[PDB]
Amino acid sequence: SIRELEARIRELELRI
Amino acid sequence: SIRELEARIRELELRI
Amino acid sequence: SIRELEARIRELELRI
Ligand code: NA
Ligand code: NA
Ligand code: NA
Ligand SMILES: [Zn+2]
Ligand SMILES: [Zn+2]
Ligand SMILES: [Zn+2]
HEC letters along chain A: CHHHHHHHHHHHHHHC
Quick one: closest CA in A to B14, which residue? Answer: A12
| Cα C1 from Cα A16, distance rounded (Å) | 22
B–C CB contacts, 8 A cutoff, strictly below: 16
Query: What CA–CA distance (Å, rounded) separates C7 from B3?
Result: 15
Cβ atoms of B5 and A6 closer than 8 Å: no
Nearest partner of B15 among A1, A15, C6, judged by Cα: A15
Alpha carbon distances (Å) from C10 to B4, B7, B13, C2, C16: 12, 13, 14, 12, 10
CA distance C13 to C10: 5
Cα(C4) to ligand 4 centroid in Å equals: 20
Q: Is C12 exposed, middle or buried (0-12, 13-18, 19+ CB in 10 A)?
A: middle
CA distances from B1 to A5, A14, A15, C9 (A): 12, 24, 25, 13
Question: Is the dihedral angle over the CA atoms B4, C3, A9, A14 positive or is it negative?
Answer: positive
